[model samples]
Target: ASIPSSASVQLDSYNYDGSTFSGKIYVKNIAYSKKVTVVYADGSDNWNNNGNIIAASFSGPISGSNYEYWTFSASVKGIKEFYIKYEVSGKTYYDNNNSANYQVST
Candidate 1:
């Protein structure tokens, strides 16, 4: 049986200029020994280039008694949708259900 777990992505803050954009992406509730990756796409559902994807590992304990996380920051030039992907026991999981759609603001 697979280990019961969950994951999510959050935007702490963001800023946008007429020509550029920047923001922080927080990946939370990651299970231990698993890796979480953050990927983004525009509202139209086009994925960003590889340069915009960020991945981090969870180093906390694996007892599932505590929550672990990974934070990623990126600056790109458009509003986009963010998702968190993780791997557990060689199986990959995604947080598209809790995906965060972000838009640039002045």
Candidate 2:
């Protein structure tokens, strides 16, 4: 038996001139137990945890039938990278793939 879980995070848009950014991210095709965290790196010394930079987090049993969407707004000075982090047990199902870790930029 195999269990797999998969999720995705995307950065729709951001504004650096006024230090404001906004984007939408979503997770889908998940199974087993997991936790998802979205992080942003603004090419600075520290990662901003403010509502803007580190916008959302998900933890619990994921329903594979539907995807969860989250929108985030943050104060960043320049262009940056946004990614998703996930952790799972021995085995999990993600959109048909079996893995416990994944990362992507949007």
Which candidate's TM-score is highest?
1
Give the runs in model 2 whose Cα sits over 4 Å from its true position. Answer: 1-17, 29-36, 43-53, 57-65, 87-106
Give a tens-digit lDDT track for model 1, residues 1-106.
1222443433444444543444443444544466666666653556746345666544343354344434444455554555556666667767554434444332
My TM-score estimates for the predictions, one after another, are 0.49, 0.42
Residue-wise lDDT of candidate 2 within 13-102, one digit each (tens)? 333344565544455534445554445555552346623234344422325535555455656554445455544454432221223222
Query: What's the CA error at residue 26 for candidate 1, in Å?
Result: 8.2
Return the clash pairs for model 1, or none. Answer: none
The CA lDDT at 2 in model 2 is: 17
What shift in Å separates residue 90 of candidate 2 from its native position after superposition? 8.6
